[PDB]
Amino acid sequence: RKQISVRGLAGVENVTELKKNFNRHLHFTLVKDRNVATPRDYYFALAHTVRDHLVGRWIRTQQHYYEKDPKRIYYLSLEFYMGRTLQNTMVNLALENACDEATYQLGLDMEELEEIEEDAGLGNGGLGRLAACFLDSMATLGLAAYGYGIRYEFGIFNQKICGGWQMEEADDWLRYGNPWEKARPEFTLPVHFYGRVEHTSQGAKWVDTQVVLAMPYDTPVPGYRNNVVNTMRLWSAKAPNDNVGGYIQAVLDRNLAENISRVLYPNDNFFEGKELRLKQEYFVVAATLQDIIRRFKSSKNFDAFPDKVAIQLNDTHPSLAIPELMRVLVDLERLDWDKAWEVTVKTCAYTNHTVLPEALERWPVHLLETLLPRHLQIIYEINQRFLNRVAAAFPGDVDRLRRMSLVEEGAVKRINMAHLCIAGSHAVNGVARIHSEILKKTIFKDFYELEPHKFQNKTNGITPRRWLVLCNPGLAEIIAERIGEEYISDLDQLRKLLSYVDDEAFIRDVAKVKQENKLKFAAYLEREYKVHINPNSLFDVQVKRIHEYKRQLLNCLHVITLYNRIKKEPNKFVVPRTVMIGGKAAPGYHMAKMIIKLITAIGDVVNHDPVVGDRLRVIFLENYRVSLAEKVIPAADLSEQISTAGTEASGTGNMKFMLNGALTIGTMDGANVEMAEEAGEENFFIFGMRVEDVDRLDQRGYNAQEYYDRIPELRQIIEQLSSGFFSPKQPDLFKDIVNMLMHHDRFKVFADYEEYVKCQERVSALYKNPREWTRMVIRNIATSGKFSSDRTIAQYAREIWGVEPSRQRLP
Amino acid sequence: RKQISVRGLAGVENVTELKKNFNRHLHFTLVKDRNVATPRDYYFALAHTVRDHLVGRWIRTQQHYYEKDPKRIYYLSLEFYMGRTLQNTMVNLALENACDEATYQLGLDMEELEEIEEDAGLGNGGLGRLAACFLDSMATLGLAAYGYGIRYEFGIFNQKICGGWQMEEADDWLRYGNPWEKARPEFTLPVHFYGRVEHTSQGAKWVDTQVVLAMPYDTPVPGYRNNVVNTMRLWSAKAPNDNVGGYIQAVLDRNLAENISRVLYPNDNFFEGKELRLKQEYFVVAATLQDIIRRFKSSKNFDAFPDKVAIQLNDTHPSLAIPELMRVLVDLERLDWDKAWEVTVKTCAYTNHTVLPEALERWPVHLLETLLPRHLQIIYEINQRFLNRVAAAFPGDVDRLRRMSLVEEGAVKRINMAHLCIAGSHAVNGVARIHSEILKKTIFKDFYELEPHKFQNKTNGITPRRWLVLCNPGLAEIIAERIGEEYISDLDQLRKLLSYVDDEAFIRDVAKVKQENKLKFAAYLEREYKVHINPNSLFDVQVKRIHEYKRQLLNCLHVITLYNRIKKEPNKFVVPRTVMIGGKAAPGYHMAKMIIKLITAIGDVVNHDPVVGDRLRVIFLENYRVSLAEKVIPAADLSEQISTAGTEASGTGNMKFMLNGALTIGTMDGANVEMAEEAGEENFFIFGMRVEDVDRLDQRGYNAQEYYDRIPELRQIIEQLSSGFFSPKQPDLFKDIVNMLMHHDRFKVFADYEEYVKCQERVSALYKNPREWTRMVIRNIATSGKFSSDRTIAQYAREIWGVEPSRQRLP
Ligand SMILES: OC[C@H]1O[C@@]2(CC(c3ccc4ccccc4c3)NO2)[C@H](O)[C@@H](O)[C@@H]1O
């Protein structure tokens, strides 16, 4: 427990001070005493005690940036998937052992207290979590960086499983308050909606608008033991300051404006063109850019703006920053268009995260005209000048003009926000090598040919603080025992572990740590859900949002295959497996909801077959979220990363599993390709179509029937699904799944079935050899260094932002 | 400043500690340093520092009640007009001088900091303010007392005057947070609405309900220097725990339930039968009674309930407590009806505050059936048994049965909540002697004849902490200089001041203090509104909610009379006056809004007539509220208390003026009668019809025309109003006022005009003699002791609650 050296020192005076301040907060802050105090009270007492330790550094860091006047980095995102904050703060401030000891002396288990904290679940998955890892890395690398987003009252919904189906409940994460945020109502700013444009004496004027106030809440972002504490600023919607029925209703109607920040849109990789979403996007953009402009002016004429400001667009969601910056510079600051545009492009950079056409933002022009009339005007002017440049570069190429235009023609005329982003940014990057290459090759080929220098790659990463030191201290410890602690903010040092592939002690310890994590996760499921899992089974884990492209269905086909093979040959030994699948489906995503039901339905049969017993178990992990990822990933043996080649832009869950001692079964997709490159393909369970094979199938037409006709075992499974074998009380329950698989499968599940099953056989074969399993694991952990988000951020800093990262400690 | 001894000691170590804790809060709580810190930051730093001093006493007091197990007093109100808390806390904890010194040493003016605090304006006027004074007195008298109400997000609206008209703005009092409250989400309770009744095996069951959660916020209520800190618990509405459009809308629709605690209904003396108001009333009642029941059970079978619980109903607004208690005792606790009813009546007591029929609560039975079906059933059963008692007591008296029934017949069948309250309470009281007498004489004569022992008087009071020591420390000081400090919680000791009616020093000092207060108020108007007032004028003040019965219009007639008399005889000396009128009109109250416009319109003419100059000025005091009352009342020379005899149940503003060195012009109405009795009528400017005279006019019919025909000066004014003299750009602007006065005046303004004007002449005559004015003032201050809310509460305690008050200090 405390034996773990990476968790820091429990200094005698520090422990004494912590206990004193713990008790002080219990008394003065919580207004409790030990007689009526609950574990929740004790969590809050600890949270406040720990938060106090951030204050000095937080003030000093922000003063430091004022004095040093570095270029400031503004990371704009609609999502920040932060998770819990207590343990992270302790780790980054080197207080974990001290607080553990302090709480122990008070008769409390700190780990029990940590479980009280709600996730800040202000994101959907990978995109939101990337933003969170990025904040952590930017602070650790000493960058003057500011996360900007929306403080949703309700984050990603809490998932309940009832009758085998997903049920959604409001994520009321602020119910007991957030001890980490500091409300800043004094720095509230006005955001404008609707209205109209007057073109007059000085120029254009946006008038007759409806105002929504943006109230900022600042959350500290501690760097790893460098005394840096940066800021995440999240905006909250507030109704503007200024008959009985009339009056009362008028007060109640304040809710309408305040609804802007009420709830996170729960879609992963899907664009839903709701007006409320558009308001949210403009809300963050307008308030944020006001802050940026104010800070710029309070630092020493807009020529130096791009020298002192970088705006990073987390996908196109804050793309309105481009026309908003132009609006402020032209309409308010009175710069000429050309200069303002020069400034804007040098300030802004765009990160693309998605490949699926339905995930791209294309807003109807009518909606933009009504809500943001001046922005639409500016977008049209941007388009005219941009297409003039295309026309000059490629004279007579009319189709290219049509393809590149920010304006999409059709029944409903729309603005392509990705096109706007490329036009208005000096850099455009994808999120893994394969993805960034395909951007230049197909998706934005025309833009790449116009401005090749714009296009970059920044392979994603994860923070080794949250995703190793916090969630897997046992693994962190056995590593530090061999190579010291430098790797925690220099993850490439993990390559030193290749020297221990034949080290008996290290082989022993790696396996020991994994088993400890598996026991702990089994204890979690037993405690929280009364679900029993076989501790001596292979933990086969697919955790990620439920999506057709991510192919949970392919996993389902394999699970049924294992079941059917057992039933055909009950006497034949098979490596016992616990197959775990978890993830949320978007509320409006019918197929994803059906897929969850199929997983539970498969479990209903498999988990109660006496011939199978504990040899195979299929469980659906309820309410997959950051806090759960921190529990299950360190317990995983096999990481399922089985998206159709070309569909997962990068993935980040893949990296978490690799860092935490799981072996990977995956396609050559997203960052899987680079992970396999780093480790050596011999150390990865790579299977299935490459992108080239998918394209060849698309060329001739994907016919699922061919695979059904040629694979007896697949045929059996489909017939089980169709006939009601997995839904005897409702035989036709899965007809939609069967129909999609047979006739309308965009993701070619059947095409990878045979290779997947065979690859899984090789997984089982290696697991039968514990020594060699663990040695391959070592080869994975040791080469996961590239996938630190420190590496990613250092690249953003040097290649896009023009700032030099620094691990230098503040006084 | 600090010379003021009543403000306590500035102990050296105390000042040192306060400065240290001030700076600590600025750093750790506010996350600021002296470079960026605003006066608001400094206010909050002081607020947190002062609040810390309540904590020990607050915990100790509540533990004391658990140990001592006294009878607990629950004061249920829909309104708590608390005002600001910073100064009050300092006064009651003897910290004012210490904090003044501490802040001074830090380079800050504490009075400037105090002005930053928002009023907790969770009431309309007198009723809400009475509740607030009562909380203060109950803590000062060492009673185990709990205020229970609703934490409105928006209190009484902020009043703006624009173009001479009232404009309403949302009172966003929680914008910067409330440092005084402690959120208790852990003690959240479910409140049920709608649904239906099942009568089954065990009995009746309320099922299929919609749930709204009640989250409590506790606010400390310090007694005067007795180390007692009681609790005001205010409930906040929270939505219960458990397609894309569908999901998002479902989350947004949480606002509907949460609207229950959104806004205070802004009506003074008017019943508006809105469903939302009914929900608010049940919301407080249901959550509160759950608390009461829980505390009762956690203290040592329902036989002892009335021995350990008192429920005081602040008017009929929480009247649902009666059927709710019956519901819990019968349906949930399984007591037989008779026993439950015995318990209920002994537990509950009802205070009636209003005389006007339109202020009485009469809820349509259809609304009660839909919203609270089980409560309606219980009400009907209460009615049947109660009328059985009436029938037994008065055999054959069928009309009495009809008159006394809780059920009112007609086109819309309604429940009379006052009747329910009398039936279900062991005590019923009015709020001044005249009012309590008329309850037994007319309004509830039938109930008085049935149960005379139920009927009591409890003349209202005001706290001499807020209403003397806080708002008028200069007066508090000159009093303490002669008689010591005991009077602060023993106000009857002010009678000792009668010994100083001929004391030259005291006459000098009383007049000096008044002039100081007048200078300060003039400085306030100049600073905040750039309005200049004549410091050497009589400050003639009518501050109270705008109501026809309160007769601001009569004041208007007198003001115009003064103006017209000056114009007729410009050379004749008149005592210079500044006539100040302030108060909010209910948003839906057209006549009240017109009256505000008339006051400003009169000012528009009078204040700009060069013949008048500074001899007469008429100003409308914008946004009258508790904090403003604390400023203007100590500056007042003349207190306008001019309600039609029989219409003001008590009044409390009257008492504030008397305590603060103003002489009173008033009718024999409400507590005015007792005030004049205490001081001697020779020391009051009493004028106009007595109740007997009003009744005689009602008997023959009020004909306003008679007065118009007989009073030339009145005729002139009405013709000025009709012809557009006070609205030249809109000649007919005041036609509705004129029409009401001439043909539909329920409050007989014309009937008191002549006596009012003549009485005002006598006011001016006495003001010409400063010595004799001040001597009469002394005679008023010295006899204001009866009107301490300590006296009132001691009476409630002994005569209704069955508890003995105690000024005993806690350790
Ligand atoms: O770069 C971070 C990650 O970004 C994605 C895209 C993505 C996402 C999330 C929310 C969205 C909302 C609207 C439209 C597209 C969205 C895409 N979530 O995960 C990619 O699917 C994933 O491969 C990548 O690792």
Ligand SMILES: OC[C@H]1O[C@@]2(CC(c3ccc4ccccc4c3)NO2)[C@H](O)[C@@H](O)[C@@H]1O
């Ligand atoms: O007892 C305290 C005071 O109570 C009254 C009654 C009152 C009031 C306030 C809000 C109301 C809301 C609905 C119905 C009646 C109401 C009466 N406000 O002032 C009386 O009008 C006043 O004379 C008395 O001093």
